[PDB]
Amino acid sequence: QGVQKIGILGAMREEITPILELFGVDFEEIPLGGNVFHKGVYHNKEIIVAYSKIGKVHSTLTTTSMILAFGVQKVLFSGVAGSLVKDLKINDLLVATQLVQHDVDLSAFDHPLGFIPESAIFIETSGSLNALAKKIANEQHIALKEGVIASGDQFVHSKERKEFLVSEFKASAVEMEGASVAFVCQKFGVPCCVLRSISDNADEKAGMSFDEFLEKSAHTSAKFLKSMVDEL
Amino acid sequence: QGVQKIGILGAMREEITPILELFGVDFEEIPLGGNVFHKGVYHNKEIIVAYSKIGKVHSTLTTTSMILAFGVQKVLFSGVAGSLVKDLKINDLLVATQLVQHDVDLSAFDHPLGFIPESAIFIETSGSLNALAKKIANEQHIALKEGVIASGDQFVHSKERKEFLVSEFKASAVEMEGASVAFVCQKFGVPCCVLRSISDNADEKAGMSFDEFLEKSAHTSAKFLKSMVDEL
Ligand SMILES: Nc1ncnc2c(CN3C[C@H](CSCCCc4cn(Cc5ccccc5)nn4)[C@@H](O)C3)c[nH]c12
Ligand SMILES: Nc1ncnc2c(CN3C[C@H](CSCCCc4cn(Cc5ccccc5)nn4)[C@@H](O)C3)c[nH]c12
C-alpha cells in the first residue's frame, strides 16, 4: 500500500497545542512558506500537523502546502467557531457538511452571494469521513451536529451579520478558514473533514466569550479529531 | 546558473489570452489543482502561465502551486483593475508597490482593518522588479503609475466603498487577487510584481465598463508584462 499520510490543520497555535499533546509522539518541525509543519508517526500513519494562521488566504496557502509538499492523502481540520443557531451551545461539536465563503460578492454581475464563476456557492466535504465522525460520536455518546459552516475574513460579532448568514446560506456556525481548506481539498481531490467546537455566539459579546472558551473548545475538537484518526 | 523559471499569472482566462498570444511560443498544458499551467521556453527562460480563477482563495492556491510544483523564482501578475483615483483613467497602467486585503476585519479585537495577527496590513512587492517596470515605462514613454492596490472578495461598484478604500488604505486601485498573490510570494521569499490596467471606475457603472474594456485593458497589461520579461 504505502504509509498513509494525514494532514491535520488548525488556524491558530491554540487550536493545535492540544492536538500535539494528545497524539503524544515526537514531531520533526519543518519550516515552509511561513508555516511550521510538525511531522510524526502514529499507528502506521504519518501525521503532518500545522496551524495556518488566521483567515482565508493563510488557510488556503497552508492546505496547498500540505498537499503538494507533504503529499497528504486526507486533511482533517480542528478548531473553534461561532454558533449561529440556538441548539449549538458553547463547547458543542459540529462537522461541516458543506461550507461557503460568506463574504464573496459578485452581485454586480447578477451572481448569487457566495458564488464565483468556475466554482460553486457550497463546497462539499468527505461523506465517508463525515459518516465516520457520526459513527464514532454515536458510540461515545457525544452530541455531534452537522450543518453548513460559513467562512469569511471577518470575525462576526453582530446580530445583523448572524441573521444574514442564516437567511442567505442556512449556516449553523461561522469561522474564517473552513471553506478555504475544504475548497483546496476539493480542487486536489483530497478527502476533507472540518470539525469545529463552539467558542462564542458570534454576537456583540463574542470577543470576550472567545477569549474565555478558546482553550476548552479547542481541546474538545482536538480530542474528537484524535478519535477519528484512531479509526483511519 | 540554471534556467530561470518565471511564473506569469492572471485571474481570468481573458487576462492570459493576450499573454499566450504575445509570447508566441509553444506551450505544454499541465493540469494541477483545478488550474491549467502553460509551460513554454522563451529567451533562456522557462515561462509558466496560468489564470487562477477569480478572488483571493483561487489566486492564493494557484500562486502556491506555481511556487511548489513548478519551482518559479519570480511571479509577475497581469490583469485589470478598478480605479479609485481621478488620475487613473481607463487603460492606464499601475504597478502595485504595496497591497492590502481590504475586506479583512478583526476590529472586534481592536485590530486595524486589513490586519491579521502574524501578518501585516500592507504586503510589499519587489523593489527591483518595480524599478525595472519604471525604467522600461520611461524608455517607452508609457505613463506608469505606482501605488497601493486593495484586494478583496467583492467586485466594488459604489461610491461609498471606493471612498472607504481611499480613506482607510490610501489605495489607488481595487481588484480581487493582487494582495493574495503578493502575500504568497512574500511567504516563500519569491520576488513578485503586480501590474494592472484600469477597466472601470469601481462605481455604479463599473460592471458595464468592465465588460466593455476587459479585452483592451488586459492586452495593455499583457504587453507591458512581456516587455518586462524581455529584460529579465
Ligand atoms: N464569531 C466568530 N467569527 C468568525 N470566526 C470565529 C471563530 C473561529 N476562528 C477564531 C479566530 C478569530 S480571530 C482571533 C484573533 C485573536 C488574536 C490574537 N492576538 C494576539 C496575537 C498576535 C499574534 C500572534 C499571537 C497572538 N490578537 N488577536 C479565527 O481563526 C477564526 C470563532 N468565533 C468566530
Ligand atoms: N471594480 C472592481 N472591483 C473589484 N475587482 C475589479 C477588477 C479586477 N478583476 C476582474 C474580476 C471581476 S469579477 C468578473 C466576473 C465576470 C463574469 C464572467 N461570467 C461568466 C463566466 C462564468 C464562468 C466562466 C467564464 C465566464 N460571469 N461573471 C476579478 O478577477 C477582479 C476590475 N474592476 C474591479
Side-chain angles (χ1 to χ4, degrees), chain A residues 2-85 87-158 160-204 206-232, chain B residues 2-85 87-158 160-204 206-232:
Chain A
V3 171
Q4 200 183 335
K5 299 178 177 174
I6 301 166
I8 297 171
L9 286 172
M12 293 173 71
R13 182 180 305 268
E14 293 83 353
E15 290 165 328
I16 74 160
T17 295
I19 297 171
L20 296 172
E21 200 283 325
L22 291 168
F23 278 98
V25 299
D26 295 324
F27 290 102
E28 187 192 350
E29 300 189 1
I30 300 164
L32 178 69
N35 293 123
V36 173
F37 297 85
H38 301 254
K39 177 158 87 172
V41 195
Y42 183 82
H43 301 164
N44 279 182
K45 304 154 191 83
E46 181 161 275
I47 55 163
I48 310 291
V49 183
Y51 77 95
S52 60
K53 299 166 284 180
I54 290 158
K56 295 196 298 184
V57 170
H58 279 135
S59 59
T60 300
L61 189 168
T62 310
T63 306
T64 306
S65 291
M66 279 196 155
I67 291 168
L68 292 177
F70 296 88
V72 302
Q73 189 266 146
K74 299 183 173 73
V75 171
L76 311 177
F77 186 98
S78 172
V80 307
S83 173
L84 301 176
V85 296
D87 68 290
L88 273 174
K89 311 181 298 309
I90 306 309
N91 206 56
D92 285 349
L93 282 167
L94 176 64
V95 63
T97 49
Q98 297 172 297
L99 301 95
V100 61
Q101 294 182 61
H102 68 75
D103 58 354
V104 163
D105 183 351
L106 294 178
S107 66
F109 299 101
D110 299 314
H111 296 300
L113 297 178
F115 180 78
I116 306 178
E118 310 184 50
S119 191
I121 297 172
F122 296 98
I123 303 306
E124 290 77 35
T125 50
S126 165
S128 53
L129 291 173
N130 294 160
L132 176 62
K134 290 169 61 281
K135 182 176 181 291
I136 292 162
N138 180 67
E139 290 166 357
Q140 321 276 238
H141 310 296
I142 289 163
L144 178 67
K145 266 81 93 183
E146 62 163 38
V148 170
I149 293 187
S151 308
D153 272 342
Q154 311 77 42
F155 183 82
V156 176
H157 62 119
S158 70
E160 291 76 16
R161 190 67 180 171
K162 287 179 73 170
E163 289 179 3
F164 165 81
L165 298 176
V166 172
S167 67
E168 190 70 28
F169 301 117
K170 303 205 166 68
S172 290
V174 61
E175 33 88 319
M176 303 175 67
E177 304 82 14
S180 33
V181 175
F183 179 83
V184 172
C185 289
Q186 178 195 69
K187 294 302 104 171
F188 286 98
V190 170
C192 179
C193 182
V194 176
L195 298 166
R196 297 287 196 160
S197 177
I198 300 308
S199 56
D200 60 86
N201 298 128
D203 63 6
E204 294 78 12
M208 284 178 46
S209 183
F210 173 85
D211 288 343
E212 180 172 7
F213 293 110
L214 172 61
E215 187 182 32
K216 179 51 178 181
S217 298
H219 186 269
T220 298
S221 185
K223 190 166 181 286
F224 195 84
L225 181 149
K226 178 159 184 300
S227 80
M228 295 186 67
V229 172
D230 286 337
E231 303 298 326
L232 295 178
Chain B
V3 171
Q4 200 183 335
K5 299 178 177 174
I6 301 166
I8 297 171
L9 286 172
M12 293 173 71
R13 182 180 305 268
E14 293 83 353
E15 290 165 328
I16 74 160
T17 295
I19 297 171
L20 296 172
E21 200 283 325
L22 291 168
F23 278 98
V25 299
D26 295 324
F27 290 102
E28 187 192 350
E29 300 189 1
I30 300 164
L32 178 69
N35 293 123
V36 173
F37 297 85
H38 301 254
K39 177 158 87 172
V41 195
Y42 183 82
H43 301 164
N44 279 182
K45 304 154 191 83
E46 181 161 275
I47 55 163
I48 310 291
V49 183
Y51 77 95
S52 60
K53 299 166 284 180
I54 290 158
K56 295 196 298 184
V57 170
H58 279 135
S59 59
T60 300
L61 189 168
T62 310
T63 306
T64 306
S65 291
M66 279 196 155
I67 291 168
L68 292 177
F70 296 88
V72 302
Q73 189 266 146
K74 299 183 173 73
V75 171
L76 311 177
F77 186 98
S78 172
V80 307
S83 173
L84 301 176
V85 296
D87 68 290
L88 273 174
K89 311 181 298 309
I90 306 309
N91 206 56
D92 285 349
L93 282 167
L94 176 64
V95 63
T97 49
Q98 297 172 297
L99 301 95
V100 61
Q101 294 182 61
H102 68 75
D103 58 354
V104 163
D105 183 351
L106 294 178
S107 66
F109 299 101
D110 299 314
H111 296 300
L113 297 178
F115 180 78
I116 306 178
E118 310 184 50
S119 191
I121 297 172
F122 296 98
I123 303 306
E124 290 77 35
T125 50
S126 165
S128 53
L129 291 173
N130 294 160
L132 176 62
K134 290 169 61 281
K135 182 176 181 291
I136 292 162
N138 180 67
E139 290 166 357
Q140 321 276 238
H141 310 296
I142 289 163
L144 178 67
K145 266 81 93 183
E146 62 163 38
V148 170
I149 293 187
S151 308
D153 272 342
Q154 311 77 42
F155 183 82
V156 176
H157 62 119
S158 70
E160 291 76 16
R161 190 67 180 171
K162 287 179 73 170
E163 289 179 3
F164 165 81
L165 298 176
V166 172
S167 67
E168 190 70 28
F169 301 117
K170 303 205 166 68
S172 290
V174 61
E175 33 88 319
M176 303 175 67
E177 304 82 14
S180 33
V181 175
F183 179 83
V184 172
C185 289
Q186 178 195 69
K187 294 302 104 171
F188 286 98
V190 170
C192 179
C193 182
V194 176
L195 298 166
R196 297 287 196 160
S197 177
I198 300 308
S199 56
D200 60 86
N201 298 128
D203 63 6
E204 294 78 12
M208 284 178 46
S209 183
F210 173 85
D211 288 343
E212 180 172 7
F213 293 110
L214 172 61
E215 187 182 32
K216 179 51 178 181
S217 298
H219 186 269
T220 298
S221 185
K223 190 166 181 286
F224 195 84
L225 181 149
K226 178 159 184 300
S227 80
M228 295 186 67
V229 172
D230 286 337
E231 303 298 326
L232 295 178

